[PDB]
Amino acid sequence: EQFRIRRDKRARLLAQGRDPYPVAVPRTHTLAEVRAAHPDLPIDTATEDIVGVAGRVIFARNSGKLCFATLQDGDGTQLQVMISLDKVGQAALDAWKADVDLGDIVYVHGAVISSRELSVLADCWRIAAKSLRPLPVMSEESRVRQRYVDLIVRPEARAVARLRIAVVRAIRTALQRRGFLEVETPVLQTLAGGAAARPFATHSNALDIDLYLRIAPELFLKRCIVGGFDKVFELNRVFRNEGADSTHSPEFSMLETYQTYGTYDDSAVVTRELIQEVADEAIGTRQLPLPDGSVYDIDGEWATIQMYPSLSVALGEEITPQTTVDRLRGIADSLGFGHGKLIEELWERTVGKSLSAPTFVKDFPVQTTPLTRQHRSIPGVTEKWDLYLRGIELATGYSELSDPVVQRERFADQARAAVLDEDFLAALEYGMPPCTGTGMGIDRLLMSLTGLSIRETVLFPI
Amino acid sequence: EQFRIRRDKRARLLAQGRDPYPVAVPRTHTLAEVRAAHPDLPIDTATEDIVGVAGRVIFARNSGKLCFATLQDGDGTQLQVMISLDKVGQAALDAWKADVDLGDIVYVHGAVISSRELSVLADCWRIAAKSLRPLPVMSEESRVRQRYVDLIVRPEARAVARLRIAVVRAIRTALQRRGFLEVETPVLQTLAGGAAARPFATHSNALDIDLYLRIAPELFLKRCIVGGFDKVFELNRVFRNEGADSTHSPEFSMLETYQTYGTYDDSAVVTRELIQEVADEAIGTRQLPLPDGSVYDIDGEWATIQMYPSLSVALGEEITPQTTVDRLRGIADSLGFGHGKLIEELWERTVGKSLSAPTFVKDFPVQTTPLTRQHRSIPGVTEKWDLYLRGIELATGYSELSDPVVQRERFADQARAAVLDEDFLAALEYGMPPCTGTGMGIDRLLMSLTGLSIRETVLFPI
Numbered sequence: 039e040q041f042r043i044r045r046d047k048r049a050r051l052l053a054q055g056r057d058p059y060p061v062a063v064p065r066t067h068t069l070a071e072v073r074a075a076h077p078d079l080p081i082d083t084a085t086e087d088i089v090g091v092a093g094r095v096i097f098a099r100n101s102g103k104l105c106f107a108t109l110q111d112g113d114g115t116q117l118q119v120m121i122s123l124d125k126v127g128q129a130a131l132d133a134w135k136a137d138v139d140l141g142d143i144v145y146v147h148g149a150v151i152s153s154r155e156l157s158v159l160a161d162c163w164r165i166a167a168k169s170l171r172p173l174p175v176m177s178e179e180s181r182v183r184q185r186y187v188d189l190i191v192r193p194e195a196r197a198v199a200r201l202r203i204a205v206v207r208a209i210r211t212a213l214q215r216r217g218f219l220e221v222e223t224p225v226l227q228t229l230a231g232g233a234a235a236r237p238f239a240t241h242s243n244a245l246d247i248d249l250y251l252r253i254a255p256e257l258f259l260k261r262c263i264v265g266g267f268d269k270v271f272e273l274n275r276v277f278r279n280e281g282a283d284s285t286h287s288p289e290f291s292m293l294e295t296y297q298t299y300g301t302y303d304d305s306a307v308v309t310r311e312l313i314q315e316v317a318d319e320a321i322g323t324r325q326l327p328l329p330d331g332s333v334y335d336i337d338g339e340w341a342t343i344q345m346y347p348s349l350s351v352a353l354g355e356e357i358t359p360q361t362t363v364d365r366l367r368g369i370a371d372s373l374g375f376g377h378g379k380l381i382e383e384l385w386e387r388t389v390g391k392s393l394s395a396p397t398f399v400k401d402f403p404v405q406t407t408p409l410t411r412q413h414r415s416i417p418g419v420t421e422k423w424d425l426y427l428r429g430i431e432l433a434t435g436y437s438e439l440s441d442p443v444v445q446r447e448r449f450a451d452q453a454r455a456a457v458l459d460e461d462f463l464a465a466l467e468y469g470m471p472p473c474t475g476t477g478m479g480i481d482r483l484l485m486s487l488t489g490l491s492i493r494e495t496v497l498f499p500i
Numbered sequence: 501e502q503f504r505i506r507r508d509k510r511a512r513l514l515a516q517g518r519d520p521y522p523v524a525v526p527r528t529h530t531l532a533e534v535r536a537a538h539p540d541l542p543i544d545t546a547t548e549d550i551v552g553v554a555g556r557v558i559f560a561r562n563s564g565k566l567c568f569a570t571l572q573d574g575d576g577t578q579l580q581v582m583i584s585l586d587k588v589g590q591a592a593l594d595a596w597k598a599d600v601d602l603g604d605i606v607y608v609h610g611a612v613i614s615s616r617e618l619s620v621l622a623d624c625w626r627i628a629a630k631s632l633r634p635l636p637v638m639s640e641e642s643r644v645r646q647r648y649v650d651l652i653v654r655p656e657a658r659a660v661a662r663l664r665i666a667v668v669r670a671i672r673t674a675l676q677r678r679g680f681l682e683v684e685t686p687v688l689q690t691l692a693g694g695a696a697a698r699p700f701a702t703h704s705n706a707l708d709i710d711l712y713l714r715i716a717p718e719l720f721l722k723r724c725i726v727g728g729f730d731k732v733f734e735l736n737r738v739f740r741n742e743g744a745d746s747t748h749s750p751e752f753s754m755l756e757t758y759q760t761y762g763t764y765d766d767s768a769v770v771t772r773e774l775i776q777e778v779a780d781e782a783i784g785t786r787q788l789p790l791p792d793g794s795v796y797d798i799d800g801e802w803a804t805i806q807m808y809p810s811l812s813v814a815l816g817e818e819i820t821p822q823t824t825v826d827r828l829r830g831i832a833d834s835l836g837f838g839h840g841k842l843i844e845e846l847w848e849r850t851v852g853k854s855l856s857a858p859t860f861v862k863d864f865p866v867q868t869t870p871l872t873r874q875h876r877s878i879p880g881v882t883e884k885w886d887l888y889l890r891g892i893e894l895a896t897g898y899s900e901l902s903d904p905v906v907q908r909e910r911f912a913d914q915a916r917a918a919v920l921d922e923d924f925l926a927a928l929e930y931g932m933p934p935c936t937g938t939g940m941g942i943d944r945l946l947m948s949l950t951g952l953s954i955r956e957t958v959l960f961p962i
């Protein structure tokens with residue numbers, strides 16, 4: 039019902055030649071600027087520094103000859119205003135009382151004082167916007183269907199939104215210090231490749247074909263290495279037409295990075311530094327506090343373990359690239375398609391779940407890693423690592439497969455479970471120098487650093 | 501046929517326990533690093549600075565006891581190598597001659613000398629990648645179907661790719677200096693809005709509905725202002741399921757920016773500075789040279805003209821918001837749906853086409869601008885500008901419409917040519933402070949600054 043009273047203050051303001059939504063207002067400082075300015079003001083004393091400020095009224099204490107409001111800026115910073123009879127306007131005070139609700143954006147010019155809390159004592163005042171919905175005094179999934187309200191009433195939502203923006207800045211800073219170049223590769227592709235996922239298709243009207251949103255930029259980033267890029271990345275959305283869960287969404291921000299003439303050994307060291315540098319820039323500590331109330335140390339060096347050896351110790355027997363699927367299925371049952379899949383799953387179900395300190399696992403089954411180079415010395419495994427931080431599958435890197443005839447086979451196997459990415463394979467046969475790629479999910483980065491769910495990390499999900 | 505000889509050098513290299521695609525090679529410096537190091541070396545003299553370098557062989561001059569190649573790095577920098585009998589390997593020289601083609605990535609360790617041009621005289625040498633396609637010695641649309649080849653053989657394609665990356669860096673730098681925060685808003689939306697375009701739809705499997713790729717981020721960026729963001733932008737892809745032409749593609753990179761408590765007057769000044777700052781950072785001059793051989797001055801202040809007045813002078817009669825469509829159609833015929841559309845078109849066909857210096861046109865027909873605030877003083881027009889640079893429709897800005905009941909109407913009109921964006925309108929009725937948005941196309945920015953077509957500006961189009 040308050041929806042109607044509010045619409046009728048707008049109307050009776052328009053009729054009266056009052057502007058409820060004025061083009062401009064001369065806001066001289068932010069309330070943060072007015073705070074940093076008067077940090078220690080002897081309380082109940084006045085100062086002749088004049089300011090125009092605008093804020094959202096989020097409390098009002100109306101009292102005859104004197105109204106007090108709390109004006110909150112968009113960052114949450116608060117200044118109190120004092121709409122007084124005596125300064126200017128009995129009619130201003132009546133206008134104030136009658137026209138000004140809660141959730142109203144409001145400009146006030148005048149003197150900066152501290153009362154018997156930092157306030158502005160009004161020379162003038164005007165409305166900048168008239169709200170036709172009162173602020174509520176909120177469930178998770180209603181907070182997320184209405185982030186704009188969440189950001190006004192919930193300081194934490196402000197803190198989280200700024201945090202992600204700061205993490206993303208810190209990332210670009212870290213990669214740019216190291217000579218990486220940020221490139222833009224296609225989101226619409228004739229076939230989507232470079233990961234294991236079911237793509238979003240769309241019809242094009244220009245071309246009268248179906249196109250596919252990128253599952254991953256890897257294949258196009260590898261054409262940039264062929265093309266002569268030394269050090270490239272791309273920090274931008276990927277689209278995977280699968281289910282949502284606590285570490286999975288169909289649209290999410292993902293970093294990929296390629297460095298020429300380094301291996302997975304080299305890109306492990308960079309991923310650690312990059313994460314540690316981000317924590318410092320954006321959180322101020324490598325001793326990460328959690329909603330637990332616990333503290334997760336990500337400082338220092340990080341453990342590396344091999345999948346097969348670590349799996350062997352966990353199962354009490356030698357598991358090699360040679361170990362048959364009949365053997366592996368057997369073990370699987372004893373707990374509760376093919377070899378590559380079984381190793382990773384058995385590993386995930388035994389070693390994976392027990393991890394707590396930040397660990398790299400490396401040397402992976404050749405079957406489940408079609409784009410990564412065969413290991414230099416160990417037959418049957420690829421030079422790939424997964425990074426687990428606070429138990430989250432955070433990041434991965436490869437020594438990259440630059441052999442086209444091998445790469446052709448890897449795909450010819452995939453498919454038989456038969457059109458390949460012939461222009462990608464074309465690019466490799468022009469010669470791709472030896473290089474190491476990485477990938478990392480921005481949402482998993484935040485979750486691993488904060489505790490925050492994926493539906494708190496993204497501004498506008500669904 | 502050379503496709504077959506090459507595949508058979510790979511095979512007879514694998515059989516021989518030679519690695520044609522080795523995991524690693526110990527590249528100590530880039531050829532650029534080796535150049536900056538020995539800038540003035542008394543020619544035909546040797547120096548005992550040892551380096552490992554890797555490059556692509558893009559010339560070979562094989563000559564009995566001594567082979568010369570030009571090794572080109574990926575940035576185009578060149579060093580010459582001298583594979584000699586006498587330094588190490590008669591068998592190395594035979595291996596060189598027999599195994600090493602053109603378009604082959606190649607590592608060589610040894611001494612840095614200048615011959616009778618800066619070269620490395622080989623202690624060792626190894627292949628890093630074996631190319632199974634010779635470099636061609638290329639049409640526009642074959643250069644663009646194969647950018648990876650273009651980047652190797654065409655220096656200009658290198659220069660253009662780096663230029664775009666530098667423009668994009670310069671933009672983020674400029675907006676961040678000014679306190680703007682970069683946000684990520686959804687690409688997949690339940691309905692796409694904030695511009696005039698036909699969207700790409702896609703089916704979701706999670707939700708079993710159609711979703712739509714964003715035509716523009718405006719509606720979501722306005723929820724961030726409601727939400728308390730002072731100064732926001734977003735530099736990221738938009739998707740418009742329309743035709744391609746010389747200033748139009750269905751996927752393109754687009755900047756949008758919102759500033760609270762400024763108008764279109766304010767965002768005109770920022771757009772000029774932003775463009776001028778970009779030119780300086782990324783081009784080194786505001787006196788922009790073109791393929792013409794001409795020079796386009798973008799320095800100094802820029803002309804502002806009003807649409808209706810400028811149109812009037814061009815047509816020889818008073819054209820106002822009042823001027824009927826019958827009158828406008830009449831004029832249209834005399835040269836060769838509704839009022840708003842007719843003003844902009846007549847303007848575009850007379851005043852628009854005659855512009856050369858960088859000009860802002862402002863005060864627009866209310867009909868063709870549903871999201872921009874009605875002008876403060878002039879009835880019938882909206883506070884909007886278009887910026888024309890070297891005759892390209894580069895950028896636009898609005899004093900933003902924060903009135904929900906007006907905004908509801910603007911849409912209720914649109915539709916009747918009836919489901920609206922009710923959550924967007926919901927956000928406005930919580931109150932959006934007065935603000936000014938802008939938008940600019942990155943491809944048009946480059947085209948306007950360089951002369952370059954849209955199909956040279958984007959790394960991987962189609």
Ligand SMILES: COc1nc(N)nc2c1C(=O)N([C@H]1[C@@H](O)CCCCC1(F)F)C2
Nearest residue numbers: 285286287290431432433434477478479
């Ligand atoms: C919500 O985020 C995701 N959503 C989906 N649906 N799928 C993935 C993520 C994610 O973060 N992924 C990682 C993961 O594979 C760790 C190593 C590689 C980097 C990554 F981004 F792909 C996969």
Ligand SMILES: COc1nc(N)nc2c1C(=O)N([C@H]1[C@@H](O)CCCCC1(F)F)C2
Nearest residue numbers: 747748749752893894895896939940941
């Ligand atoms: C290849 O780029 C584009 N492609 C399409 N299909 N549509 C537009 C562009 C572009 O650059 N556009 C500008 C233009 O409207 C100038 C003022 C606003 C900014 C913009 F990016 F929308 C529209």
Ligand SMILES: N[C@@H](CCCC[NH3+])C(=O)O
Nearest residue numbers: 232233254256475476477
């Ligand atoms: N394309 C990979 C990330 C890069 C891996 C290294 N080349 C993925 O989506 O998992």
Ligand SMILES: N[C@@H](CCCC[NH3+])C(=O)O
Nearest residue numbers: 694695716718937938939
């Ligand atoms: N959404 C606009 C750009 C922003 C205009 C200012 N609010 C467009 O695509 O043209």
